[PDB]
């Protein structure tokens, strides 16, 4: 107690500049306000960079929601009309509670949030990337609530491992 698995996101490279901000001001502000460690890494491919967030369950969600706001706000200013999905990366070993019983908890979460949630096919991953991509289509507030309940279920697998 409490759980130590990070939230990993895949965000479009479009919106990374705004998430970091000028002089790294935006990202630092989010780490202060959420007490998180946020690190932005290139990803071998997709035109996306990964964002790793180590914090408490709640600060993680607070940080995720801020990133969703900034992404959506940035999407307005470059006239990006499409809905920007939230893509959570989750290690395959810890997705059993989401995909288990014909994806019951996945569809449960869909219904509770008004989101369309899709998980990348097992076959798509490599030995260099064991993380499944969980794509949540919705909107800022609905994607963030969806992140809370997805990461709850991912942490349930992790904390009931063996």
Numbering used by the authors: 192 to 236, 239 to 355
What does the original paper state about this entry?
Research on IMP3 largely focused on its association with many cancer-related tumor entities, since its re-expression correlates with a poor prognosis for patients, classifying IMP3 as a tumor marker. Importantly, we used a very long degenerate sequence (N40) as a basis for SELEX, to allow multiple RNA contacts with more than a single RNA-binding domain, and a corresponding bioinformatic spacing analysis. This led us to the discovery that IMP3 recognizes—through the activity of all of its tandem RNA-binding domains—an extended array of multiple cis-acting RNA elements, composed of CA-rich motifs and sequences with a common GGC core. Members of the IMP protein family are prime examples for multidomain RBPs, where both affinity and specificity are achieved through simultaneous engagement of multiple domains with their respective RNA elements. Taken together, our in-depth analysis of sequence requirements for IMP3–RNA interaction and the functional validation supports the suggested safe-housing mechanism: Through sequence-specific formation of RNP complexes, IMP3 shields a specific region within the HMGA2 3′-UTR that contains miRNA-binding sites in close proximity, thereby protecting the mRNA from let-7-mediated repression.
Our SELEX approach based on a N40-degenerate sequence revealed that the KH domains recognize two different types of RNA motifs: CA-rich motifs and elements with a common GGC core. To determine the individual contributions of KH1 and 2 (Lys192 to Ile355), their RNA binding was inactivated by mutation (GKEG motif to GDDG), while maintaining the crucial tandem context, resulting in four possible combinations. Our NMR data clearly proved the integrity of all constructs. SAXS (small-angle X-ray scattering) data back-calculated based on the crystal structure are in good agreement, indicating that the crystal structure reflects the monomeric solution geometry, which also closely resembles other tandem KH domains. Indeed, KH1 clearly favors binding of the GGC motif, while KH2 prefers binding to the CA-RNA. Given that larger NMR CSPs were observed for the KH1/GGC, compared with the KH2/CA-RNA interaction, RNA binding appears to be mediated primarily through KH1. Indeed, ITC revealed a measurable KH1–GGC interaction in the low-to-medium micromolar range, while the KH2–CA complex could not be determined in our ITC setup. As expected, a 10-fold higher affinity compared with the single interactions of 7-mer RNAs indicates a cooperative binding event that shifts affinity by one order of magnitude. Our data suggest that in complex with KH1–2—similar to the situation with KH3–4— the RNA adopts a looped conformation that fits the narrow window for linker length between motifs.
